[PDB]
Design a protein around this ligand. Structure first.
Ligand SMILES: Cc1ncc(COP(=O)(O)O)c(CN)c1O
Ligand SMILES: Cc1ncc(COP(=O)(O)O)c(CN)c1O
Ligand SMILES: Nc1ccccc1C(=O)CC(=O)C(=O)O
Ligand SMILES: Nc1ccccc1C(=O)CC(=O)C(=O)O
Ligand SMILES: O=C(O)c1cc(O)c2ccccc2n1
Ligand SMILES: N[C@@H](CCC(=O)O)C(=O)O
Ligand SMILES: O=C(O)CCC(=O)C(=O)O
Ligand SMILES: O=C(O)CCC(=O)C(=O)O
Ligand SMILES: O=C(O)/C=C/CC(=O)O
Ligand SMILES: O=C(O)/C=C/CC(=O)O
Lengths: 404, 404
């Protein structure tokens, strides 16, 4: 810096902000010849570019001033209306909720942290959970309680145990954050019973549930789950959706649906952070839903990604040595791998890159960073032939790691 | 709310967020048939819609995957590079600075608050200043020091006097926030001597200057000022620009240029707030600048607004009674009016609306809400015949107000 010790101007929270060594390493990896399984990007082959071109034309013909002018903080009315009708019909979400458009779901997470969290307030997350949610919430200094996943998602029975223990200490949880369908990073889905059990606990212990659902339309097998929000009789759930993995991420348009008192406060918090979400992309998203193109395109996204999931699951079964385990997602973008014998997957990353493969070590996905033997793999966006070769390279790296 | 006392879940800062009575009133006014001079919107007649259509075509042909995929937090590299070349050539801003793309300048103000402000830190603003900057920074709980404007912008001598008084209390200012060209709301411009004086004080007292410049290209008379940033040999200035008033606000694209140590911290802070600014609008903006269209379009924006500033200045001179004073902007969107005899312009707004005219009362533009006799008028976004009729209605409202 030209200011010398620029840190002298920084706030306390800014002084705690750091670049991640692993993040920086993976950025460098993505530009080289290594087969990276570390990405969290959707595949541009799934972006509906012809439909988008037709919508851009339509916008310049018919809606140009609306798309180009400042918008309201809450969002473009027609997009709000179209999303609530979609959400109603498709998922059974109740029309008594209100809706706000956000600059991606990522912004929704930051607003959640702003509107609900005082320093020390307790937030329950899954272990693992979405890394950037931990990052959004950490600005507001919560305390976390981690609830392990199994193959049927959050172990809600362990959450009950922890709630009773917190109660015995005169403490309570304020928010439970869940990514309950095709989780980033674990790939697994909370079953129906657990969703209903979560909502009983939310009533009994008086907390808010944030359901973050980017991936529910990217279903490749099985039958559709009930959204937690569709079971929410009390108005305790805030449901987050996004166009990032159903349209394209580049428009940065997401939505937040919940109790109108909650949404009103979120609108005021958002006003100061950005004035509105970009209206141009909101009009694109409105045409995409209201014109029926979303409903038509979803099955093409699904046909695209399914064989990539399946190739990766075949390669793991064929190549991985005994002791290695992995999730079996019904949808989404990720498979999550657990190593035997106490291998530390972060230390192992060095070895993996030297054998021509990369993955995200799972440690940063745990709020307590306490689990060291996990990895997140992505199947959406390496070449579909590079999945087999990637998984083989990873398998051989694990074999080498396991010996003397 | 269906949760009853939903406030039980809200953070301390959320409990102190409130809707503004006047802002809500003015929203209702814009719907109706009142002549509103209260807007802060640019006129869609200045949006370069043909150029935008050609660029959208171009993007879908050549840049579709870049425009539709997630971007880096810092911004789209070609827009960053083209902006730095533009700012170098046009304004003489040094290439030693770094640049981050923001989701409007508004987001830049929130990030400045996050990165620099601990509760109690002292921020100097102009009196009046940009309302949404007060609102952005208020989340971070600064103390403000207010420096009056005169017709040549911030009275930097008064800022020296206050810096000396603070120093005698063992205290110092962290950030001076200035909107030094065609201010929103006052319309006036800090002269060159004061710019240089500000930067000497910045050195002597060790603070950072945030220069927020949405309007500098909307110049209708006079010669171009030197940007404070162009005079900044120490790297103490963070320069904020936006495409809102020179392309269209709907893309929500702005930029922040400053010391690389500062910009690195801003990038980390942003990452968790929104991942990236919408890439699709960043590509549009990149073509608009690099393609030479910004430079061609600026003179058409200026030709459009100039006669509207002039009509409003003519009407005020012809209609306003004695004692009323107003600023005489060389550019931008606003003219600022001062009422005599202790009229409270907030109380007078009711009277004005009954006579078919509206404006923004000036009180909320003061950090200390202590000046009661001012008003912000906008000339960009009506009609341009309703300007004369609006100002006449306003003049008669003031005459009646001045009577018992
Ligand atoms: C769990 C989760 N939450 C939210 C996000 C952030 O998404 P957005 O692009 O909407 O900001 C993602 C990525 N699709 C995610 O995996
Ligand atoms: C002084 C000032 N700063 C910031 C902004 C917000 O601009 P943006 O659309 O880039 O968020 C405005 C509105 N043009 C403004 O007048
Ligand atoms: N590779 C990605 C692409 C898009 C969103 C997240 C990811 C990630 O998994 C991490 C990342 O770099 C980020 O979030 O900014
Ligand atoms: N609308 C805005 C957009 C950006 C910044 C200020 C404002 C306003 O001041 C409000 C306004 O224009 C209006 O209600 O017409
Ligand atoms: O005079 C007012 O009471 C007033 C007027 C405004 O335009 C405001 C905008 C934002 C916040 C508070 C506000 N208060
Ligand atoms: N290890 C993280 C980087 C951030 C962190 O370590 O906290 C990742 O793989 O994305
Ligand atoms: O998850 C999907 O991909 C479908 C729609 C949705 O749930 C969302 O995008 O938020
Ligand atoms: O006009 C200027 O001088 C710079 C301000 C500007 O145009 C912008 O922010 O876009
Ligand atoms: O898909 C994504 O963008 C999320 C990836 C998980 C993370 O690294 O935050
Ligand atoms: O819209 C603008 O350009 C300025 C608005 C000022 C405000 O009311 O915050």
């Amino acid at each position: 810096s030209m200011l010398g010790d620029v840190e002298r101007f920084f706030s306390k929270k800014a002084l705690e902000m750091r670049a991640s060594e692993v993040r920086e390493l993976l950025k460098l990896v993505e530009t080289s010849d290594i087969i990276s399984l570390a990405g969290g990007l959707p595949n541009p082959k799934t972006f509906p570019k012809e439909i988008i071109r037709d919508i851009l034309v339509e916008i310049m013909e018919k809606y140009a001033d609306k798309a180009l002018q400042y918008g309201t903080t809450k969002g473009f009315t027609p997009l709000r209306e179209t999303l609530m009708k979609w959400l109603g019909k498709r998922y059974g979400i109740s029309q008594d909720n209100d809706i706000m458009i956000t600059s991606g779901s990522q912004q929704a997470l930051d607003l959640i942290g702003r509107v609900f969290l005082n320093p020390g307030d307790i937030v329950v997350v899954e272990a693992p959970t979405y890394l950037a949610a931990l990052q959004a919430f950490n600005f507001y200094e919560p305390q976390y309680i981690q609830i392990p996943l199994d193959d049927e998602g959050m172990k809600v029975e362990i959450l009950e145990e922890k709630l009773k223990e917190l109660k015995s200490q005169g403490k309570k949880v304020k928010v439970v954050y869940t990514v309950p369908t095709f989780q980033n990073p674990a790939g697994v889905t909370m079953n129906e019973d657990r969703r209903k059990y979560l909502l009983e606990l939310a009533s009994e212990y008086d907390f808010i549930v944030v359901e973050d659902d980017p991936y529910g339309e990217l279903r490749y097998s099985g039958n559709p789950e009930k959204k937690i929000k569709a079971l929410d009789n009390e108005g305790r759930v805030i449901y987050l959706g996004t166009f990032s993995k159903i349209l394209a991420p580049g428009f940065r348009i997401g939505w937040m649906v919940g109790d109108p008192g909650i949404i009103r406060k979120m609108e005021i918090a958002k006003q100061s952070t950005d004035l509105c979400t970009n209206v141009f992309g909101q009009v694109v998203a409105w045409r995409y839903v209201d014109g029926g193109y979303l409903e038509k395109h979803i099955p093409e996204i699904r046909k695209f990604y399914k064989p990539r999931r399946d190739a990766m699951l075949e390669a793991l079964e064929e190549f991985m040595p005994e002791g290695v385990k992995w999730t079996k997602p019904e949808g989404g973008m990720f498979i999550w791998v657990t190593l035997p014998d106490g291998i530390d997957s972060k230390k192992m990353l060095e070895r993996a890159i030297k054998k021509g493969v990369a993955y995200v070590p799972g440690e940063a996905f745990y709020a307590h960073r306490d689990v060291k033997n996990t990895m997140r793999l992505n199947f959406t966006y390496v070449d579909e032939d590079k999945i087999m070769e990637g998984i083989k390279r990873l398998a051989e790296t694990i074999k080498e790691e396991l010996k003397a």
